[PDB]
Short mmCIF file of C-alpha atoms in Angstrom, two decimals:
data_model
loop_
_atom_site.label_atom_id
_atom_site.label_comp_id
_atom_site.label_asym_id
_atom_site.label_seq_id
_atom_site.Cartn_x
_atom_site.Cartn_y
_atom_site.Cartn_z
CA UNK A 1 18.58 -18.93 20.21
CA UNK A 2 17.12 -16.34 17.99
CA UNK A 3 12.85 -16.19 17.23
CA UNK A 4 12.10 -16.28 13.59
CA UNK A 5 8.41 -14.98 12.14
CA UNK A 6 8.58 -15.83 8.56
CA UNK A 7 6.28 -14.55 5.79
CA UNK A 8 6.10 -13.71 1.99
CA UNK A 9 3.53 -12.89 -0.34
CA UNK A 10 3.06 -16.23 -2.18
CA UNK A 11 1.61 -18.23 0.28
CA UNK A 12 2.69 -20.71 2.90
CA UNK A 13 3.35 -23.44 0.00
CA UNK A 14 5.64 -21.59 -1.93
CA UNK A 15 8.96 -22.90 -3.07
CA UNK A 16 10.79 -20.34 -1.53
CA UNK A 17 9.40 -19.91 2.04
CA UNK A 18 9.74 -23.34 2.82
CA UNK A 19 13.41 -23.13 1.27
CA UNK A 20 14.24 -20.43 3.82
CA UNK A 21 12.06 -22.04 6.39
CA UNK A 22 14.56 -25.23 6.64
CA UNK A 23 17.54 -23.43 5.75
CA UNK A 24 16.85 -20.91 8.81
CA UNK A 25 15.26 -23.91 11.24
CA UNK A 26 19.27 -25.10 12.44
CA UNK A 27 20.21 -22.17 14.03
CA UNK A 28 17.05 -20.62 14.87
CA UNK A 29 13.29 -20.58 15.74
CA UNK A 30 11.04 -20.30 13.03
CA UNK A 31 7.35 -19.70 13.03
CA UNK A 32 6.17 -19.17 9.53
CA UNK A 33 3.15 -17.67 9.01
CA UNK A 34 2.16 -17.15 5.59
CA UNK A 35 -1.15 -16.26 3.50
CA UNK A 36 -3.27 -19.18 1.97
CA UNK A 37 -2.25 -18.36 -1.55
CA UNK A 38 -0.38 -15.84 -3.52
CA UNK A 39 -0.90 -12.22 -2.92
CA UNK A 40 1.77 -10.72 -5.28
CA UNK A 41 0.71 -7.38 -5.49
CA UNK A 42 -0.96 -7.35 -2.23
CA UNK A 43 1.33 -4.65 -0.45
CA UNK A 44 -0.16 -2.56 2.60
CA UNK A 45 -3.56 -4.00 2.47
CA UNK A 46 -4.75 -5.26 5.34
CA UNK A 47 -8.24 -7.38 5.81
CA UNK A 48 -10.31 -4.60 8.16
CA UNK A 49 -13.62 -5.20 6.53
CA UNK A 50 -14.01 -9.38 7.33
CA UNK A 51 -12.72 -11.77 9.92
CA UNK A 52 -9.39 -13.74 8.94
CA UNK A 53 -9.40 -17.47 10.08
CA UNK A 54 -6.09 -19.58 10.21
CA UNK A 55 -5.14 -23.30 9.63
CA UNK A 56 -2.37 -24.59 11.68
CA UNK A 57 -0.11 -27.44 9.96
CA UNK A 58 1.06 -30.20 11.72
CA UNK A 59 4.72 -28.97 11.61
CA UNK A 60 3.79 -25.71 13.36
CA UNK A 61 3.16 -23.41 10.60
CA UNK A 62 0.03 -21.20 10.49
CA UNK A 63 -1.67 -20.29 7.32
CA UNK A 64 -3.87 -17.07 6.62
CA UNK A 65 -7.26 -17.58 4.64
CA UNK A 66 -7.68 -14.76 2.60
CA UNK A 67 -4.95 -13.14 4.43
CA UNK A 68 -2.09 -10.58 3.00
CA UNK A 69 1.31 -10.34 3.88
CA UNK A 70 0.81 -7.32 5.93
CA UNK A 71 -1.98 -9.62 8.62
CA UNK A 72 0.59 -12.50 8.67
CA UNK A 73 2.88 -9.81 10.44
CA UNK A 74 -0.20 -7.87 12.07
CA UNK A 75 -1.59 -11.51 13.17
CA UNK A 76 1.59 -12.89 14.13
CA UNK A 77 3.27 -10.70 16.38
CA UNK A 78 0.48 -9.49 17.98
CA UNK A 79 -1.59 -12.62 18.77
CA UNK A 80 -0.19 -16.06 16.80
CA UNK A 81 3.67 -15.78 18.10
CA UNK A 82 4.58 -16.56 21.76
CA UNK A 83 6.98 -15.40 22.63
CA UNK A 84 7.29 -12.47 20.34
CA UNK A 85 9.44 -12.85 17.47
CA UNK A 86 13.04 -11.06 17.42
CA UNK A 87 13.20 -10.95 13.59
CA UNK A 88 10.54 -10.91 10.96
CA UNK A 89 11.47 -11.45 7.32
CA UNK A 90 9.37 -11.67 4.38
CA UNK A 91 10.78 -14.06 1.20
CA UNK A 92 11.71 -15.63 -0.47
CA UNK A 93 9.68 -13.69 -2.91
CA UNK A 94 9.41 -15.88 -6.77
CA UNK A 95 10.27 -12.53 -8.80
CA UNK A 96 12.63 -9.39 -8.23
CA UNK A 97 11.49 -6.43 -6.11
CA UNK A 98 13.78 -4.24 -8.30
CA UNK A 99 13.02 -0.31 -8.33
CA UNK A 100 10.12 1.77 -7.23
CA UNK A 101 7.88 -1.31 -7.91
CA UNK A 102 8.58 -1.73 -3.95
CA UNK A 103 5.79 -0.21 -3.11
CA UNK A 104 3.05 -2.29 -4.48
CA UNK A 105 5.09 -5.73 -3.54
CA UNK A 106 3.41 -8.22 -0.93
CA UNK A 107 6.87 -9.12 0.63
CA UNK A 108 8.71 -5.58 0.92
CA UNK A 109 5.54 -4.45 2.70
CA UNK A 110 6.07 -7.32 5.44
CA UNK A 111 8.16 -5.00 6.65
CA UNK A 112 5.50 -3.66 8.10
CA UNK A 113 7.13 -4.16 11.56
CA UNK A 114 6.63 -0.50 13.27
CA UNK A 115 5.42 -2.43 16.30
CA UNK A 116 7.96 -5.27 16.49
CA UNK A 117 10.76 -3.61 14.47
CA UNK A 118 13.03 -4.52 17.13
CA UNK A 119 14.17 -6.26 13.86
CA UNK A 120 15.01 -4.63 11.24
CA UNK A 121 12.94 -6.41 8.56
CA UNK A 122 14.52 -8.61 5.94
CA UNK A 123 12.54 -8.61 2.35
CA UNK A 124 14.82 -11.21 0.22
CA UNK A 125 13.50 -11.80 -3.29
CA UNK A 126 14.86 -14.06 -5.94
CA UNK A 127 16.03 -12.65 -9.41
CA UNK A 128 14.67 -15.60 -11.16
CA UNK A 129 13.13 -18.89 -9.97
CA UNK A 130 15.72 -21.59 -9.94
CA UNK A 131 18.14 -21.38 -7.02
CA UNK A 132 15.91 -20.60 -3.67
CA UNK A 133 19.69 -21.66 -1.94
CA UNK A 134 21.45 -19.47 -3.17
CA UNK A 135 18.78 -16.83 -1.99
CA UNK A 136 18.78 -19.03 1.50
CA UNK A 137 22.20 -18.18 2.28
CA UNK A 138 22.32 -14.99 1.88
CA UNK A 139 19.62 -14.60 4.06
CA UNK A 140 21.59 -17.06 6.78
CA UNK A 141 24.47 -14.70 6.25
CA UNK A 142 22.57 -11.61 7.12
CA UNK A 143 20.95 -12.96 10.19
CA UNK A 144 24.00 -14.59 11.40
CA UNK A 145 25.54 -11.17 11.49
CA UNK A 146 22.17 -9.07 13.23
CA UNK A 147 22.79 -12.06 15.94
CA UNK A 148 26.53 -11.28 16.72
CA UNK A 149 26.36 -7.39 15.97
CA UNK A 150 22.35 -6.32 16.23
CA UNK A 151 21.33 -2.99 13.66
CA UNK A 152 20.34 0.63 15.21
CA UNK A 153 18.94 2.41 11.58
CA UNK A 154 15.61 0.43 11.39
CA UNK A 155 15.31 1.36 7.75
CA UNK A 156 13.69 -1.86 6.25
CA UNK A 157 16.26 -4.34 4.83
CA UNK A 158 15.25 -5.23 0.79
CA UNK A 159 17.32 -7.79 -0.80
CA UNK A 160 17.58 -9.09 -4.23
CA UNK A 161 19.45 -11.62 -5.00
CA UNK A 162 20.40 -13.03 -8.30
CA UNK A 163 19.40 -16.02 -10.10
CA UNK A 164 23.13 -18.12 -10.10
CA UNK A 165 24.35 -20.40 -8.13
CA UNK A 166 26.34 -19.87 -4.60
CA UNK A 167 29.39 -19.63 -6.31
CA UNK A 168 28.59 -17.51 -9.30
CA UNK A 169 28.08 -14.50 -7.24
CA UNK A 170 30.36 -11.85 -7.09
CA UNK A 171 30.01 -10.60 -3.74
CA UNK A 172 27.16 -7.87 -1.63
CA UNK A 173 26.54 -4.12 -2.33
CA UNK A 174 24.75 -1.30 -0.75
CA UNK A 175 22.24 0.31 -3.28
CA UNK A 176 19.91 2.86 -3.35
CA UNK A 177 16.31 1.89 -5.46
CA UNK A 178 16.18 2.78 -9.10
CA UNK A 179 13.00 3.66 -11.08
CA UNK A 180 10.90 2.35 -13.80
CA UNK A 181 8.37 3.81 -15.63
CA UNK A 182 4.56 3.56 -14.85
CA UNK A 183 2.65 0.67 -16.44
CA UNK A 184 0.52 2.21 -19.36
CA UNK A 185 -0.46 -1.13 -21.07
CA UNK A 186 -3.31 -3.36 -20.27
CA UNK A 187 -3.74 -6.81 -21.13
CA UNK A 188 -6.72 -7.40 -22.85
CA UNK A 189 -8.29 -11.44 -22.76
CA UNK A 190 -11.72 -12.80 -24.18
CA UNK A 191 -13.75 -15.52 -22.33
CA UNK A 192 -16.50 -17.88 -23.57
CA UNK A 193 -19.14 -12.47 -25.13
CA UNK A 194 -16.77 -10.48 -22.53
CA UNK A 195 -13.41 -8.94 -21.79
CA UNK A 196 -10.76 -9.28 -19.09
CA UNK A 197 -8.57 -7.05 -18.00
CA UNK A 198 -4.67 -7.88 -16.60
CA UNK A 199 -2.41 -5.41 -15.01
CA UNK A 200 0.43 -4.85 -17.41
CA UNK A 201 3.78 -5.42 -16.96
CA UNK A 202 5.49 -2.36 -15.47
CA UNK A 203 7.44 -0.17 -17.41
CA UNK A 204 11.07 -0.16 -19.44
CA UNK A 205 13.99 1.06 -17.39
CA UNK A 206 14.33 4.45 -16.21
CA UNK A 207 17.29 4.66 -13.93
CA UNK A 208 19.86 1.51 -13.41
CA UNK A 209 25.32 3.30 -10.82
CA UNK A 210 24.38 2.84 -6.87
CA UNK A 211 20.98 1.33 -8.03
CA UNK A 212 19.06 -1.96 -7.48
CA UNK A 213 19.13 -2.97 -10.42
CA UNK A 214 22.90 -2.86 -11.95
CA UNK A 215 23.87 -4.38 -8.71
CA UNK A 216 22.03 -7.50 -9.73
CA UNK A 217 22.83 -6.88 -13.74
CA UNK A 218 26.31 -7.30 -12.44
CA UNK A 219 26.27 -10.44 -10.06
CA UNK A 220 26.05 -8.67 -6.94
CA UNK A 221 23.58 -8.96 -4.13
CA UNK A 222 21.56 -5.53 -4.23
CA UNK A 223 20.15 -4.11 -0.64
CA UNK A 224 18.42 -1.39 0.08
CA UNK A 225 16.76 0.36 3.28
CA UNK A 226 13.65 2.06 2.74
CA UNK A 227 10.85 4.28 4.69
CA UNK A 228 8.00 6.09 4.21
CA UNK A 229 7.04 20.72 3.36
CA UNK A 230 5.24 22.83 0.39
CA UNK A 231 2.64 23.75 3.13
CA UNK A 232 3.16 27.36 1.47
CA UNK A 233 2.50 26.84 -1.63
CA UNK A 234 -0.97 25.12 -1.02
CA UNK A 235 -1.68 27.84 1.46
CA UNK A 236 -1.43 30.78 -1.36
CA UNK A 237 -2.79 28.71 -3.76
CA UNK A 238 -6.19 28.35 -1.79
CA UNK A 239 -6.27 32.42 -1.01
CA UNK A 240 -5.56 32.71 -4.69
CA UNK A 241 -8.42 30.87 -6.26
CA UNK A 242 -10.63 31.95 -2.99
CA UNK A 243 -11.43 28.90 -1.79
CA UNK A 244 -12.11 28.18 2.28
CA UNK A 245 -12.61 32.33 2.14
CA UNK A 246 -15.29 34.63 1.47
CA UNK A 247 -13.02 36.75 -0.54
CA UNK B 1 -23.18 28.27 -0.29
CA UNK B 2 -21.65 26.99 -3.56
CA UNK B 3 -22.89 27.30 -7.13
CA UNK B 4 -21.25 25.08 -10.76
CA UNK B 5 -19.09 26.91 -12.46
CA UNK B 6 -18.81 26.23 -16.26
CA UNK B 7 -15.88 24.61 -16.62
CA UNK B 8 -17.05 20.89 -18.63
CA UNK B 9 -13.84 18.91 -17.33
CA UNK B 10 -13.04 15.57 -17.20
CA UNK B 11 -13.10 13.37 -13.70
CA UNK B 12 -12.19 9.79 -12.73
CA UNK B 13 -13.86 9.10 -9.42
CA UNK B 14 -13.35 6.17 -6.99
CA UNK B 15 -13.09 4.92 -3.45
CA UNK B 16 -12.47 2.21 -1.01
CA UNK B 17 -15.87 1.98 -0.20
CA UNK B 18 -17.43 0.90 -3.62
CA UNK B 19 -20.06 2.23 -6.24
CA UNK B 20 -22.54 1.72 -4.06
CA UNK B 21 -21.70 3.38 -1.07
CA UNK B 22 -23.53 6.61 -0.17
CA UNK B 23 -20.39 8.73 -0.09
CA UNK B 24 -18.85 8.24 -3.55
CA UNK B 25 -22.71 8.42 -5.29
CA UNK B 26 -22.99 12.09 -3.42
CA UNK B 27 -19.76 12.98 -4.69
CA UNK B 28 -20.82 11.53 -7.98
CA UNK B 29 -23.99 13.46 -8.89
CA UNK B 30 -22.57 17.17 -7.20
CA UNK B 31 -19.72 17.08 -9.38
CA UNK B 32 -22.10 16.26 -12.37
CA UNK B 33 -23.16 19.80 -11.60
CA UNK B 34 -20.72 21.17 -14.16
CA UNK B 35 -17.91 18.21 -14.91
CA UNK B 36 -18.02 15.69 -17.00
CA UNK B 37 -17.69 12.48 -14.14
CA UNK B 38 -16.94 8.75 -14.93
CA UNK B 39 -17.32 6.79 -11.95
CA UNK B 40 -14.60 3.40 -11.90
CA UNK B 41 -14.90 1.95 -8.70
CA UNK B 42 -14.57 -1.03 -7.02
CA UNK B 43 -17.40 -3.96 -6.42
CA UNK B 44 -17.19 -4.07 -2.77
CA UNK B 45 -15.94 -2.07 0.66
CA UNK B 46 -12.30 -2.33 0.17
CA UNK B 47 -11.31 -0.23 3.49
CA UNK B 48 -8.03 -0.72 4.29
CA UNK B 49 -6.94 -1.83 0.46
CA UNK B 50 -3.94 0.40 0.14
CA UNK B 51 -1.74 0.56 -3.21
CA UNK B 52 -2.78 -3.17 -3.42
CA UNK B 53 -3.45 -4.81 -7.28
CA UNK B 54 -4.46 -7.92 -8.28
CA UNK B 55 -0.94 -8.68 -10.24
CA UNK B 56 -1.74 -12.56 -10.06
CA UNK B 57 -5.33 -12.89 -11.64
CA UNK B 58 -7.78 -11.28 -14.45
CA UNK B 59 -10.43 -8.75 -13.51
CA UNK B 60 -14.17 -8.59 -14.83
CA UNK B 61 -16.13 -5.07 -15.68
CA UNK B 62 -19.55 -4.44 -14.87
CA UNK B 63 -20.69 -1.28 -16.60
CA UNK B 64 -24.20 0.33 -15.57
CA UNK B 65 -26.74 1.44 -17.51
CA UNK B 66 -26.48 4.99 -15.76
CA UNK B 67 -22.73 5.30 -17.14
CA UNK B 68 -20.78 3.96 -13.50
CA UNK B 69 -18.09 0.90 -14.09
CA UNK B 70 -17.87 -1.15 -11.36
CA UNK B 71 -14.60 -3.75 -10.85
CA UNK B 72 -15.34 -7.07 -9.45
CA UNK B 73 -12.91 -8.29 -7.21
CA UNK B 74 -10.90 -5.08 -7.91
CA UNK B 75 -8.95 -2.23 -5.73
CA UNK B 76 -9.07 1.39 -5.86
CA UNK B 77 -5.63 1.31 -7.32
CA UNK B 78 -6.54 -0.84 -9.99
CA UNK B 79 -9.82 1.47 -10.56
CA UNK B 80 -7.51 4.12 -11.44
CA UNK B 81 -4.92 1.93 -13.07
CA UNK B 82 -7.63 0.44 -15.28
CA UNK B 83 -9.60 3.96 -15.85
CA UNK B 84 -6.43 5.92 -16.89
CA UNK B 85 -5.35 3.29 -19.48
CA UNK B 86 -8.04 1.52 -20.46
CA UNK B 87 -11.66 2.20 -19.72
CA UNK B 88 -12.10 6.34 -19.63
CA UNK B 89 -11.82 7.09 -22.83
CA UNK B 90 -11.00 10.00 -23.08
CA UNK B 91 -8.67 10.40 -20.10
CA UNK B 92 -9.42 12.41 -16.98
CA UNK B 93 -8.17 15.74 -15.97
CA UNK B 94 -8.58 14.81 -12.27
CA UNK B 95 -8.56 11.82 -10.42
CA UNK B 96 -10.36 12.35 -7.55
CA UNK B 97 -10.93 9.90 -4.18
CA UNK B 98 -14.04 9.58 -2.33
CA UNK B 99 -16.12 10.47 -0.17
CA UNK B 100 -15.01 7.99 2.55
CA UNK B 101 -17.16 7.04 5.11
CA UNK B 102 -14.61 7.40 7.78
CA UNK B 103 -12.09 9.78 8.55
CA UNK B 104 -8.56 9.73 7.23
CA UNK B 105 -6.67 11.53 9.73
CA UNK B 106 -2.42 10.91 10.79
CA UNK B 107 -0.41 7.85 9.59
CA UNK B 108 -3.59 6.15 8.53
CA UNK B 109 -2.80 7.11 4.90
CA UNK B 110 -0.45 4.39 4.15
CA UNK B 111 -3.08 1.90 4.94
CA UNK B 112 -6.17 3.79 3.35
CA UNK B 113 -7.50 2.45 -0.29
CA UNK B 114 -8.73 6.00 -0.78
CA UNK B 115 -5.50 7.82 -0.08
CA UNK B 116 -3.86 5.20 -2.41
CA UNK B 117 -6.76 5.67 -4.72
CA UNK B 118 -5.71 9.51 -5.01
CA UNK B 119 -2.22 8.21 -7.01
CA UNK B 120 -0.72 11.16 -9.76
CA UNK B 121 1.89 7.81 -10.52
CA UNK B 122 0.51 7.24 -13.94
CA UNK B 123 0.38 10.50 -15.35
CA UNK B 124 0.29 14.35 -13.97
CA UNK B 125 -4.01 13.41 -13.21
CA UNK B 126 -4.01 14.63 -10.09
CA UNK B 127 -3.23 16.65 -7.36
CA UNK B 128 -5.98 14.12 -7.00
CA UNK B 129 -8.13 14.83 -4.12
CA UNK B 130 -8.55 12.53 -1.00
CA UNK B 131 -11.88 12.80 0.57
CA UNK B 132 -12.98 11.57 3.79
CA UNK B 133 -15.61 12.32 5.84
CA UNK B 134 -15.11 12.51 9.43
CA UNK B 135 -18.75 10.78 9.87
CA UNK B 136 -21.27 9.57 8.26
CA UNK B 137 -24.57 12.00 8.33
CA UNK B 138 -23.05 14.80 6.06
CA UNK B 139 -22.19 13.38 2.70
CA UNK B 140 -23.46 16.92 1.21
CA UNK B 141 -21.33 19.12 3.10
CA UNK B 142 -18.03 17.22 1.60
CA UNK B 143 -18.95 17.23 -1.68
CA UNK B 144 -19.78 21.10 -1.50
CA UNK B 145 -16.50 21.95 -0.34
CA UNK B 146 -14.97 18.98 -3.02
CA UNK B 147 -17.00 21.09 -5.25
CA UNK B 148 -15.19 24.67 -4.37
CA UNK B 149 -11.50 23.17 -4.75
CA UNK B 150 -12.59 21.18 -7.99
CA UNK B 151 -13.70 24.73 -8.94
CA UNK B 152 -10.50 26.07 -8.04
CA UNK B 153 -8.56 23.67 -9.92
CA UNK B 154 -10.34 24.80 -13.10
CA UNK B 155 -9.69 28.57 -12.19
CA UNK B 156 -6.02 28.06 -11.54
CA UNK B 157 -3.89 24.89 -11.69
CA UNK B 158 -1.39 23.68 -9.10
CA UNK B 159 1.97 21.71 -9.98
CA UNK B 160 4.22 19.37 -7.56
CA UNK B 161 1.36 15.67 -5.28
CA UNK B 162 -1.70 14.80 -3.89
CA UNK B 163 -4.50 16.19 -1.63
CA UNK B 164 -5.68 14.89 1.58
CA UNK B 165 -8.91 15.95 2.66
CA UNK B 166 -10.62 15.51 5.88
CA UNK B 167 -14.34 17.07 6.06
CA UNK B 168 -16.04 16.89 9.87
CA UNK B 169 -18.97 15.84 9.84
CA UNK B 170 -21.73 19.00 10.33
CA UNK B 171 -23.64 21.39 8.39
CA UNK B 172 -22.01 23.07 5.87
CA UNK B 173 -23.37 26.51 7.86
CA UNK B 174 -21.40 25.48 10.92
CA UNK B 175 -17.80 24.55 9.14
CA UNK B 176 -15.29 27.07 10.10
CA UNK B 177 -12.86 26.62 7.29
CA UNK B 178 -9.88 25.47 6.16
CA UNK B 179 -6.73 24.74 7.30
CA UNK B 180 -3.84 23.75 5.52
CA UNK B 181 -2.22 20.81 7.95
CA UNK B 182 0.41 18.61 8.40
CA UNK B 183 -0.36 14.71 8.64
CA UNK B 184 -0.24 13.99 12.45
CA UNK B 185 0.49 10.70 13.90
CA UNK B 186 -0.94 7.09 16.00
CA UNK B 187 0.42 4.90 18.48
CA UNK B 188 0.86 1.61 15.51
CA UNK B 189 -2.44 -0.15 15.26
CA UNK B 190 -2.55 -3.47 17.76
CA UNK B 191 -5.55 -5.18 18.34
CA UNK B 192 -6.53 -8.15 17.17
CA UNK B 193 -10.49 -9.25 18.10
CA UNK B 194 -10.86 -12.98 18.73
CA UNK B 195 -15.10 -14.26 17.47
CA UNK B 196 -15.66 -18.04 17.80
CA UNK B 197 -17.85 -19.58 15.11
CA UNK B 198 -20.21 -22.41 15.57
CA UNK B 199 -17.76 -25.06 14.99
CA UNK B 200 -15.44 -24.59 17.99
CA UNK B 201 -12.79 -22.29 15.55
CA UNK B 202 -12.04 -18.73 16.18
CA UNK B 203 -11.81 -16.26 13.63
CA UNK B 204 -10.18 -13.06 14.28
CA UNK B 205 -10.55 -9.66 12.82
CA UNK B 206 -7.85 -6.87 12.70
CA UNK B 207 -8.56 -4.27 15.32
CA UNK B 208 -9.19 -0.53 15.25
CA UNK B 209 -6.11 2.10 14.91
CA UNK B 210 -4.51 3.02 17.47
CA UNK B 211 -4.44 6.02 19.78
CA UNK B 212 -3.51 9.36 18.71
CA UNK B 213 0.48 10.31 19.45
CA UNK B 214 0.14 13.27 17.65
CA UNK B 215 -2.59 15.86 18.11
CA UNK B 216 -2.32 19.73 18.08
CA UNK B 217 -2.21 22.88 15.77
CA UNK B 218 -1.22 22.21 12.19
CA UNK B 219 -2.32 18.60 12.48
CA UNK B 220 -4.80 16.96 10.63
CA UNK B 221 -6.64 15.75 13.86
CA UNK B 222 -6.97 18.97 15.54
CA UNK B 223 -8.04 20.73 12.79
CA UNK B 224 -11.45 18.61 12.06
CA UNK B 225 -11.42 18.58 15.90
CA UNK B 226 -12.26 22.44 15.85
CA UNK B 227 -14.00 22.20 13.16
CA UNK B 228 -11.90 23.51 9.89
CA UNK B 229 -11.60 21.15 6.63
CA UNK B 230 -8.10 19.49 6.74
CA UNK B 231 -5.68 19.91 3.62
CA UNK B 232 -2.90 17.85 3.20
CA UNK B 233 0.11 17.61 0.42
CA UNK B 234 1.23 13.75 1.08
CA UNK B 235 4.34 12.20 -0.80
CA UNK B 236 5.78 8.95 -0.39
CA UNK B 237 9.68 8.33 0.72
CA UNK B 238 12.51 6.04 -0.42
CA UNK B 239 19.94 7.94 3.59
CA UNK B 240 22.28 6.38 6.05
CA UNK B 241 23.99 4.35 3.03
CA UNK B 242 27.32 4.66 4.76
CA UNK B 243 25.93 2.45 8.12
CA UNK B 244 24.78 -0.04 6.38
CA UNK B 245 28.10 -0.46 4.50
CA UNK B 246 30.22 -0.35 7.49
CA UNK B 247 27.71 -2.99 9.34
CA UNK B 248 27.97 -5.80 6.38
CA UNK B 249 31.92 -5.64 6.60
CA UNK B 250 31.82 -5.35 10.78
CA UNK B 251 29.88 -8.59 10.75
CA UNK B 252 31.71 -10.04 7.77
CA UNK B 253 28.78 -10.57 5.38
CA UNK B 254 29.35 -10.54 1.48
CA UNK B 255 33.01 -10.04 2.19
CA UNK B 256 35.45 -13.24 2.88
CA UNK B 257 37.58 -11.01 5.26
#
């Protein structure tokens, strides 16, 4: 049977965790552990400046308090899950992970498996809200497949799926990410003398053929790997402005 | 061993390690020298914050009476998303990061809140400078040579992303140089250190990074080692399309056949 350490970046209660949870508990072993609440926008961070304490559930799953998505996997592989996990996926994430936006999102950062990236890492987010099954298969596709035929290229696995049902979708394709512009706005709202401040929605759409976000546009199920030289040209510049040298 | 030139531009300065914290208020007051500085940085030590931004909840602004805007409950990515399009008014020329108490040397980058701090995404603000202090009894001797580059950058500017800089932690009198390096590398960071409270619970806390994999000449790690000031150009990455492809038909996934 095949180990399961689940995550995503909206907290162990979310709708769609505990929709992939159940849907991936009959074939395999799943040990969720999940942050406290939502961290959307969490990404890389990782709690190094305070102590993290966790709440076990009484149907095995751990919660992180104050955790991100990144110390569920840190946490969980390292201490929390014995035996060690063979696959860790993050989702399913409520919202796309479409474009360059990847890498500020909670859930495609989950795959944050370096150390136990034995598995490829599996960050499956939802076009919409509505159909966490349809989302759920897709993912019990996928892993069915990395049981019977296991993947060398540990490039992280990011999967969007679209917001129809089952049937409604057209089929898988390979895509490389897209781009969207950077968020200039800021959302401006009074309380009961001050101001806050929101992090605007990021910007219009730069570039969507082979990208993230046409595959979805269309009906198909966009993935993507993803990772992580002008030594020169810094080198003269420093001589040229004389910096680092007397002359 | 370095003088303010008279160029009056325009800087957006923040760190992991809040308004506060000795290193950034060092930095703040040497580069007041002969720039015009607006300090937006976060309300607490944020080490280890990243590109992370608080996309699910408002942030509050505490502005000081000495011109400094701290966020509460804010990141050092959201001090310079917030800064750029919002608060400094008028914009920055260059966004620099720092100083952090701490070095940040190898693949601890993608983790660091100052690194991420130091992020041209917005606009073309930077190359913004990353600065890190390998130590914590210097402050002055990174800001001097934050100071010459800053300088340098007024003198001639550089296109194409951002600047990594790793200051060891002596008198400026005893620095050897600089050295423009390549980001080395760790063995992943591991540990996780188990406390137990007075209630019977343990809480844990995320350990250390790991040891250093890669260590030599044109590394980031050697050269504070000797003694030089670290420069680094760091980019981030999005190949094997065609393996994937052949994989999700081998297994039969997406496909009915």
């Amino acid at each position: 049977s095949m180990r399961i350490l689940l995550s995503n970046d909206d907290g162990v209660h979310a709708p769609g965790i505990q929709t992939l949870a159940k849907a991936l508990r009959e074939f395999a072993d799943v040990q969720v552990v999940a942050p406290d609440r939502n961290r959307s926008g969490a990404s890389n961070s990782l709690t190094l400046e305070s102590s993290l304490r966790t709440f076990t559930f009484d149907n095995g799953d751990i919660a992180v308090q104050m955790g991100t998505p990144t110390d569920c996997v840190y946490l969980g592989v390292n201490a929390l899950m014995r035996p060690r996990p063979d696959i860790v996926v993050s989702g399913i994430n409520a919202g796309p992970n479409l474009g360059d936006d990847v890498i500020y999102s909670g859930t495609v950062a989950a795959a944050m498996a370096g150390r136990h990236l034995g598995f490829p890492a599996l960050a499956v987010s939802l076009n919409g809200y509505q159909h966490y099954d349809t989302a759920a298969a897709v993912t019990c596709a996928l892993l069915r497949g990395l049981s019977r035929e296991p993947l060398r290229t540990g490039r992280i696995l990011n999967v969007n799926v679209p917001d129809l049902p089952l049937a409604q979708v057209k089929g898988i394709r390979v895509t490389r990410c897209g781009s969207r512009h950077p968020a200039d706005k800021v959302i401006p709202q009074e309380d009961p003398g001050n101001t806050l401040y929101w992090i605007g929605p990021p910007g219009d759409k730069y570039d969507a053929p082979d990208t993230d976000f046409a595959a979805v546009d269309e009906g198909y199920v966009s993935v993507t790997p993803l990772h992580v030289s002008a030594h020169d040209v810094v080198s003269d510049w420093l001589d040229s402005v004389g910096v680092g040298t007397q002359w």
